[PDB]
């Protein structure tokens, strides 16, 4: 349930005078800024227990005095993050006094991230985990990591999972009404999946009938000086603005007759935050674009959901310092840059110092330019067409390069090395060959430079150039190709040759030991051995397990207890100008488990140790099984093993002598070490005696001497490694005066 009232987001700086507005209530974010001229005293008489759900982000910055947010937000549950703060939905910074979090009822972050840093007072950072949210909170609170059986719905104190439409927590489990937070959407008194028609969707969390947005629309119509938003209904969703292809009759988003792309004339005409990609998400005409995504984080994918709808940019595109980029394919729907503005040097496209940009797959791309490896430069030069209309003045690994399809006369791959041979493409003057460069890297989904082989005349055998690639995982597929290097000529075009990329998967090898095995004795005769599918086996993949009985310790049977060198090398090779210049002068029990990681080993004794060998096997005629790992386990002991059957026999002699004989347990808990004999006189206290195995063997029982006259009762208990057996039947006897 939602037991409270909504409030649009706010920021508060001055003192602790305005924060009291949050006693009763968010449609947004809460910012607590510049709280520098107060003391811990003002914060300590304030709380906000009603807050149960906030949408976008939560920020506290430059707040002096507060020791912790414990008792600030004692009931808040989840942040969705329809908007985000620089990839982040939660930022608290420069807290000279915040010592711990106190956000124990926190459950989920739907989108974005969290940024907490630079607090000379904050602690408890290592005891909180962000995997569950997008271990403890304080010295008074602990993380409520709900089990995966509850997924994202939430769990209760007894462990019962929340309702499917419940998210994170629930005032009563399995009740969409009693949800603390809805999984997807909310109706007036019940969390719901997808907003029954009448209540269209609202900020991906609410179901609202016409009244909500309608009111909002009237507020916007009556507002001529505030940047509110005119929400419209379409696709059963009330949305801040209709997407491209739909228009307004001012009487629901209706499809447009003529093409109506959605233009975005951003201010200042030049813009460099996933927040920014979040505004321009859904644009089609950027009426004015940069890429400075730093950090190296994989973000363009999310930007793919933002820039997958753009069509034409009315200004230059620059990919500058884009240390994080991987491609430019995310301009899937961009069509043609508008010749509206350029850059210095007329670089309407300006690439610079990228760091992981593995461009479009132009086998299908038809992107067009209006104004403004070399392989791809030539691909753009002909295919995209930066030729003719523009003059000239238009260094790294990989970089798919160009030349002319070639081939490979021989490929070999068995375990980790690949033999590659090919026809030598001798250029029109095969002295042009500086040397072949073989290219190869890992292809789950590396150069070498080869001096040109000593050419022999005739079409006879030449010992064709080739190389051995030295690096593969024994199961991973790899991509390999060759592109040559021919010396450029003054009046003779010579690009050389390139080979088509070939994919090669080397054959599997023997596997390796499985990961994280446990040998937990689930029963007195069963042991569950578990493991994990290892990543080391380097090959395809059952698992093979043996178990062997282990004898007990012998000592227990008798113990008594009673960088320039590279350029030097590439420049020295005298071998290319000395000869060339002088040419100008000379011529003037076991089990295998398939696709599973658990095995219930049976046929085991109650208190006998087992040494278990385990390995992996990638096939079932000769075993290539993996390395053997040996663990030790012990099954659960049984109390009936050490029990003694029948009473205890005894003989009496007149000289205060009692001989005692009893039956040894037939199948004890491994081995019995001693026996305990307890005797108590009639009306007196108890006395105990220990009889070891050696003592029992030598005395043929037990001898009691010095017994006082009168009645006595005796019992016997046997002691084993696991513990002690059941006491024998009491036996009465008499000692003569």
């Amino acid at each position: 349930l939602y037991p409270g009232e909504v409030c649009p987001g706010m920021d508060i700086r001055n003192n602790l005078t305005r924060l009291h507005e949050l006693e009763n209530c968010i449609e947004g974010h809460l910012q607590i800024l510049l709280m520098f001229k107060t003391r811990p005293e003002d914060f300590r008489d304030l709380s906000f227990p009603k807050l149960i759900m906030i949408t976008d982000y939560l920020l506290l910055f430059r707040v002096y005095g507060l020791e912790s947010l414990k008792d600030l937000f004692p009931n808040l549950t989840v942040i969705r993050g329809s908007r985000l703060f620089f990839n982040y939905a939660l930022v608290i910074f420069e807290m000279v006094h915040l010592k711990e979090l106190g956000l124990y009822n926190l459950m989920n972050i739907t989108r974005g991230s969290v940024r907490i840093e630079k607090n000379n007072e904050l602690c408890y950072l290592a005891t909180i985990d962000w995997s569950r949210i997008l271990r403890c909170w304080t010295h008074s609170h602990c993380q409520k990591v709900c089990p995966t059986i509850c997924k994202s719905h939430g769990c209760t104190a007894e462990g019962l999972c929340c309702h499917s439409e419940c998210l994170g927590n629930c005032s009563q489990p399995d009740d969409p009404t009693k949800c603390v937070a809805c999984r997807n959407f909310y109706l007036d008194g019940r969390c719901v999946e997808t907003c029954p028609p009448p209540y269209y969707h609202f900020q991906d969390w609410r179901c609202v009938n016409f009244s909500f947005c309608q009111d909002l629309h009237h507020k916007c119509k009556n507002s001529r000086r505030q940047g509110c938003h005119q929400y419209v209904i379409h696709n059963n969703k009330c949305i801040p603005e209709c997407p491209s292809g739909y228009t307004m009759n001012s009487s629901l988003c209706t499809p447009c007759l003529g093409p109506c792309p959605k233009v975005c004339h951003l201010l200042e005409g030049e813009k460099t935050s996933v927040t920014s990609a979040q505004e321009l998400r859904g644009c089609t005409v950027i009426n004015g674009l940069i890429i400075n995504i730093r950090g190296g984080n994989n973000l363009a994918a999310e930007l793919e959901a933002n820039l997958g709808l753009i069509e034409e940019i009315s200004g230059y595109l620059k990919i500058r310092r884009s240390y994080a980029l991987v491609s430019l394919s995310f301009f899937r729907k961009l069509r043609l840059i508008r010749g509206e503005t350029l850059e210095i040097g007329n670089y309407s496209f300006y690439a610079l110092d990228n760091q992981n940009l593995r461009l479009w797959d132009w086998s299908k791309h038809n992107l067009t330019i209006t104004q403004g490896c070399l392989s791809e430069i030539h691909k753009m030069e002909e295919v995209s067409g930066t030729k003719g209309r523009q003059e000239r003045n238009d260094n790294g690994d990989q970089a798919s390069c160009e030349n002319e399809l070639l081939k490979f006369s021989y490929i070999r791959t068995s375990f980790d090395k690949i033999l590659l041979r090919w026809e030598p493409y001798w250029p029109p003057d095969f002295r042009d060959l500086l040397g072949f460069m073989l290219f190869y890297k890992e292809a789950p989904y590396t150069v070498v430079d080869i001096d040109p082989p000593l050419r022999s005349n005739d079409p006879k055998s030449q010992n064709h150039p080739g190389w051995l690639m030295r690096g593969l995982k024994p199961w991973t597929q790899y991509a390999i190709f060759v592109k040559t290097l021919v010396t450029f000529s003054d009046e003779r075009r010579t690009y050389g040759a390139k080979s088509d990329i070939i994919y090669v998967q080397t054959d599997a090898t023997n596997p390796s030991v499985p990961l994280d095995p446990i040998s937990v004795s689930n029963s007195s005769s069963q042991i569950i051995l578990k493991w994990k599918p290892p990543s080391d086996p380097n090959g395809n993949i059952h698992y093979l397990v043996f178990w062997e009985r282990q004898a007990e310790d012998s000592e227990l049977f008798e113990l008594d207890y009673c960088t320039d060198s590279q350029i030097l090398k590439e420049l020295e090779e005298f071998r290319k100008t000395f000869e060339d210049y002088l040419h100008n002068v000379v011529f003037v029990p076991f089990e295998k488990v398939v696709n599973k990681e658990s095995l219930v080993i049976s046929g085991l004794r109650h208190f006998t140790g087992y040494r278990i060998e385990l390995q992996a096997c990638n096939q079932d005629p000769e075993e290539r099984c993996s390395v053997a790992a040996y663990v030790s386990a012990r099954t659960m002991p049984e109390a009936k093993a050490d029990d003694i059957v029948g009473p205890v026999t005894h003989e009496i002699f007149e000289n205060n002598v009692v001989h005692l004989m009893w039956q040894e347990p037939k199948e004890p808990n491994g081995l019995i070490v001693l026996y305990e004999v307890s005797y108590r006189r009639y009306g007196d206290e108890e006395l105990h005696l220990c009889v070891s195995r050696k003592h029992f063997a030598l005395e043929r029982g037990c001898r009691l001497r010095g017994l006082s006259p009168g009645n006595y009762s005796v019992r016997i208990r046997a002691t084993s490694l696991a513990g002690n057996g059941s006491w024998t039947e009491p036996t009465y006897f008499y000692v003569t005066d």
Binding site: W426, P427, P428, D429, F430, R431, D432, P452, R455, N457, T487, F488, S489, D490, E491, R492, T494, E579, D580, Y581, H583, N584, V586, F587, V588
Partner: protein, 46 residues
């Protein structure tokens, strides 16, 4: 089209016992662009 020593390996085949002519050079002629038998004959002693 030849390389290095191979260039003279066939050039002597081009020349033979004719001797060698004595008393944008051959770098521009038999190193980048293709060199054929007729032009290698010129370097041979006429």
């Amino acid at each position: 089209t030849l390389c290095g020593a191979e260039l003279v390996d066939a050039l002597q085949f081009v020349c033979g016992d004719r001797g060698f002519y004595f008393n944008t050079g051959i770098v521009d002629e038999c190193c980048f662009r293709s060199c054929d038998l007729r032009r290698l004959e010129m370097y041979c002693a006429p």
